[PDB]
């Protein structure tokens, strides 16, 4: 169930997984999925030639980046409080 290429699809599948994990308040795993997804979407952006597609992917990338930031700020804060 893995092949090379298809960056957009891989990225979207991972963020879909992150959002479910996020919804379930499983933030450590959620964050991992968000950043895996974001790495692929960045590749998707790099090789997207349709300007409208690029704008839309980029807009979503920003939204996910924003969510991922929130989760990391939460996770590391939590780890510090655990000490």
């Amino acid at each position: 169930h893995m092949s090379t290429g298809d960056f957009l699809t891989k990225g979207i599948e991972l963020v879909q997984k992150a959002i479910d994990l996020d919804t379930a308040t499983q933030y450590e795993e959620a964050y991992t999925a968000y950043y895996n997804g974001l790495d692929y979407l960045m590749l998707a952006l790099k090789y997207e030639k349709n300007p409208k597609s690029k704008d839309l992917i980029r807009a979503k990338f920003t939204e996910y980046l924003n969510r991922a930031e929130q989760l990391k700020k939460h996770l590391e804060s939590e780890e510090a409080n655990a000490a």
């Binding site: 957009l8 979207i12 597609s53 839309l56 939204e63 939460h74 804060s77 409080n81």
Partner: peptide, 26 residues
């Protein structure tokens, strides 16, 4: 049709806008 596929995938990308804000403090 690769073009229509690509366009559809982008169109249907998921949203985070339903997720609850996650505050950080002390």
């Amino acid at each position: 049709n690769p073009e229509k596929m690509n366009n559809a995938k982008v169109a249907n990308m998921p949203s985070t806008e339903g997720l609850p804000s996650l505050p950080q403090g002390e």
